[PDB]
Scaffold this active site. Structure first.
Site, PDB file in Angstrom:
ATOM      1  CE  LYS A  83     118.408 111.415  46.873  1.00 25.69           C
ATOM      2  NZ  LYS A  83     118.798 111.383  48.324  1.00 25.69           N
ATOM      3  CE  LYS A 132     116.829 117.271  47.441  1.00 23.92           C
ATOM      4  NZ  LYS A 132     116.934 116.012  48.232  1.00 23.92           N
ATOM      5  CB  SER A 175     119.579 114.030  50.915  1.00 21.97           C
ATOM      6  OG  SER A 175     119.121 112.736  51.240  1.00 21.97           O
ATOM      7  CB  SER A 190     115.374 113.245  49.084  1.00 25.53           C
ATOM      8  OG  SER A 190     116.767 113.450  49.116  1.00 25.53           O
TER       9      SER A 190
HETATM   10  C1  LIG Z   1     119.194 112.375  52.555  1.00 24.18           C
HETATM   11  O1  LIG Z   1     119.859 113.038  53.340  1.00 24.18           O
HETATM   12  C2  LIG Z   1     118.412 111.161  52.975  1.00 24.18           C
HETATM   13  C3  LIG Z   1     118.628 110.064  51.915  1.00 24.18           C
HETATM   14  C4  LIG Z   1     120.101 109.703  51.724  1.00 24.18           C
HETATM   15  O2  LIG Z   1     117.911 108.875  52.269  1.00 24.18           O
HETATM   16  C5  LIG Z   1     116.939 111.572  53.054  1.00 24.18           C
HETATM   17  C6  LIG Z   1     116.176 110.851  54.166  1.00 24.18           C
HETATM   18  C7  LIG Z   1     115.487 111.990  54.877  1.00 24.18           C
HETATM   19  S1  LIG Z   1     114.328 111.749  56.052  1.00 24.18           S
HETATM   20  C8  LIG Z   1     114.095 110.023  56.336  1.00 24.18           C
HETATM   21  C9  LIG Z   1     113.340 109.401  55.167  1.00 24.18           C
HETATM   22  N1  LIG Z   1     113.338 107.970  55.429  1.00 24.18           N
HETATM   23  C10 LIG Z   1     112.320 107.423  55.821  1.00 24.18           C
HETATM   24  N2  LIG Z   1     111.227 106.923  56.034  1.00 24.18           N
HETATM   25  C11 LIG Z   1     115.926 113.170  54.445  1.00 24.18           C
HETATM   26  C12 LIG Z   1     115.527 114.528  54.858  1.00 24.18           C
HETATM   27  O3  LIG Z   1     116.158 115.500  54.377  1.00 24.18           O
HETATM   28  O4  LIG Z   1     114.578 114.699  55.660  1.00 24.18           O
HETATM   29  N3  LIG Z   1     116.847 112.970  53.504  1.00 24.18           N
END
Ligand SMILES: *C(=O)[C@H]([C@@H](C)O)[C@H]1CC(SCCNC=N)=C(C(=O)O)N1
Length: 355
Positions: A45, A211, A42, A108
């Protein structure tokens, strides 16, 4: 002398790679495996937000503009989104840019990334082209994007250094976009959504970005930035190994940096640092300084010991001298040794004499 010249020991960090930099000076305070290519997840982003920020800075659209959601941004219409962070957009929704960018920055939201990518650049592929163009412009050596969100990208990678540098670019180049990252919550479609960056709520620091990212493949990732007085630090920690360390390891780095280092601003653009005689000019003397504000990161408590001096490239200065012409180097010193150098430039143009 021993306590003045101390090199602090670096804390042990439970992650695959990390870096700690000063935002203003760019000084690297600590690093491990900072150039190793890793799954950014993520953190991708951050670059999505940078592109959006640039488009807004350029007046391409504004926060009040409505984006009409298409099929590709439909959360429950694209199984690529399964188990990922989502804003839950559906086709036909008309959503203000302000809301989508908070979906991206706070939540995100992968769907929000697609919606903004199409709105800003016409297609995801064209948007990714922009992301990679900025990778090049920022001089990043170990970063490549394939996606607007981080998902479905086998050949995507970045590094701790490069992610800290993207954080630096967000704060520096698109400050209106960066200001969103400290927001603790926003509401969309009647549901309150909290910022995923838990450090925002840590009273012991002033964290205002940036982030988080987790996938089972990338581990726990965080780019954080915090301030204390004049000083702003950026940490990037990639492949954090435990849930319990997801904010704790970054906190360790930031607190260590503030305790042992300080940032000083000894010279601003346009202010005279030195003067030298000039030949053949409309003035007898050249006023010399810098064309970019000087920030230095030094051990905390050493500010009173900082010395500055300069060297000249040529024996004599001869007009015409252009504004910002480089004529030498400023040396900043601690304990008799040069620790930092900056170009010494002509501050006010000196044309040839006319009488
Ligand atoms: C980024 O790293 C991911 C993205 C690609 O989906 C998101 C997901 C999460 S936590 C799980 C969320 N999904 C569920 N119900 C994160 C985070 O940084 O916590 N990044």
């Amino acid at each position: 002398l021993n306590i003045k010249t101390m090199i602090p020991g670096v804390p042990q960090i439970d992650a695959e790679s990390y870096i700690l930099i000063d935002y203003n000076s760019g000084k690297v305070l600590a690093e491990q495996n900072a150039d190793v290519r890793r799954d950014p997840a993520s953190l991708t982003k951050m670059m999505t937000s940078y592109v959006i920020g640039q488009a807004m800075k350029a007046g391409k659209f504004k926060e009040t503009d409505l984006v009409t959601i298409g099929n590709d941004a439909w959360a429950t219409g694209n199984p690529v989104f399964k188990g990922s962070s989502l804003m839950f957009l559906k086709p036909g929704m008309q959503v203000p840019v302000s809301q989508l960018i908070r979906g991206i920055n706070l939540q995100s939201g992968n769907d929000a990334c697609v919606a903004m990518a199409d709105f800003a650049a016409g297609s995801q592929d064209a948007f990714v082209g922009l992301m990679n163009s900025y990778v090049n412009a920022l001089g990043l050596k170990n970063t490549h994007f394939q996606t607007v969100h981080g998902l479905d990208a086998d050949g995507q990678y970045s590094s701790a250094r490069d992610m800290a540098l993207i954080g630096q670019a967000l704060i520096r180049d698109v400050p209106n976009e960066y200001s969103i990252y400290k927001e603790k919550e926003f509401t969309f479609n009647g549901i309150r959504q909290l910022n995923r960056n838990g450090l925002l709520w840590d009273n012991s620091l002033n964290v205002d970005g940036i982030k988080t990212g987790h996938t089972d493949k990338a581990g726990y990732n965080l780019v954080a930035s915090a301030t204390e007085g004049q000083m702003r630090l950026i940490s990037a920690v990639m492949g954090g190994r435990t849930f319990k360390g997801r904010e704790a390891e970054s906190k360790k780095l930031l607190t260590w940096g503030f305790r042992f280092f300080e940032t000083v601003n000894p010279l601003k653009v346009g202010k005279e640092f030195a003067s030298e005689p000039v030949w053949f000019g409309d003035s007898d003397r050249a006023s010399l300084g810098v064309d970019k504000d000087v920030y230095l990161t030094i051990p905390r408590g050493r500010m009173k010991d900082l010395k500055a001096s300069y060297v000249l490239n040529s024996s004599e200065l001869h007009a015409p001298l252009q504004k910002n012409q480089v004529v030498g180097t400023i040396n900043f010193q601690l304990d008799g040794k040069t620790i930092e150098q900056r170009p010494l430039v002509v501050l006010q143009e000196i044309p040839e004499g006319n009488f």
